[PDB]
Amino acid sequence: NLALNKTATASSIEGAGFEASRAFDGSSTTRWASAEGVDPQWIYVNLGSSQTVNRVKLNWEAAYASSYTIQVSNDSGTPTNWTTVYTTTTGDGGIDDITFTARTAKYVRVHGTVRGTPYGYSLWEFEVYG
Numbered sequence: 001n002l003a004l005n006k007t008a009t010a011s012s013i014e015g016a017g018f019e020a021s022r023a024f025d026g027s028s029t030t031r032w033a034s035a036e037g038v039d040p041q042w043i044y045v046n047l048g049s050s051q052t053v054n055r056v057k058l059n060w061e062a063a064y065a066s067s068y069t070i071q072v073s074n075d076s077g078t079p080t081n082w083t084t085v086y087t088t089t090t091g092d093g094g095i096d097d098i099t100f101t102a103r104t105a106k107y108v109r110v111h112g113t114v115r116g117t118p119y120g121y122s123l124w125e126f127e128v129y130g
Contacts, residue, residue: 001127001128001129001130002047002049002051002130003024003045003046003047003051003107003108003128004024004026004126004127004128004129005024005025005026006024006045006046006047007020007021007045007046008020008021008023008024008043008044008045008046009043009044009045009046010034010041010042010043010121011038011041011042011043012034012035012036012037012038012041012120012121013034013035014033014034014035014120014121015033015035018032018033018034019034019043020032020043020045023043023123023126024045024126024128026125026126026127028125031061031122031123031124031125032121032122032123032124032126033061033120033121033122033123034120034121034122035120036115036118036119036120037120039113040111040112040113041112041113041120041121042109042110042111042112043109043110043112043121044073044107044108044109044110045107045108045128046107047106047107048076048106049076049106050074050076050077050104050105050106051104051105051106051130052102052103052104052105052130053070053072053085053102053103053105053108053128053129053130054085054099054100054101054102054103055098055099055129056070056085056086056097056098056099056108056127056128057095057096057097057098057125057126057127057128058095058096058097058098058123058126059095059096059123059124059125059126060096060122060123060124061122061123061124062117062119062122063115063116063117063118063119063120063121063122064091064092064116064117064122065091065096065112065114065115065116065121066089066090066091066092066114066115066116067088067089067090067091067112067113067114068088068089068091068096068110068111068112068114069084069086069087069088069110069111069112070084070085070086070087070098070100070108070109070110070111071083071084071085071108071109071110071111072084072085072103072104072105072106072107072108072109073105073106073107073109074104074105074106075106075107076106077106083103083104083105084103085098085100085101085102085103086098086099086100089114091114091116108128
């Protein structure tokens with residue numbers, strides 16, 4: 001869990017800094033919220049180092065998401081090729097749990113185009129480990 005606190009970049013935001021600062025921060029005080037606008041929408045984290053990923057935890061408040069994918073890019077070595085870990089289009093089952101192969105990359109990115117509501121994004125807790 002190296003990118004489980006660092007700074008992340010989100011295409012859309014609910015306000016001024018709601019990108020992913022308090023999203024992967026695991027801050028129980030405040031939750032991560034995003035405002036709808038331009039789609040599709042995606043969010044990735046920044047670290048600068050090469051880390052592996054396979055398990056990802058995602059929660060929803062009220063505006064649960066419909067479809068979503070988990071990809072990763074390793075620009076630290078080859079800023080061109082893209083590697084994925086898991087892909088889903090259902091996003092249904094209360095808690096969002098993603099468990100697949102352990103891909104190696106620099107930063108992780110989350111794709112999202114299909115939503116289960118007009119609301120941008122709603123996250124209460126985010127867990128990401130190597």
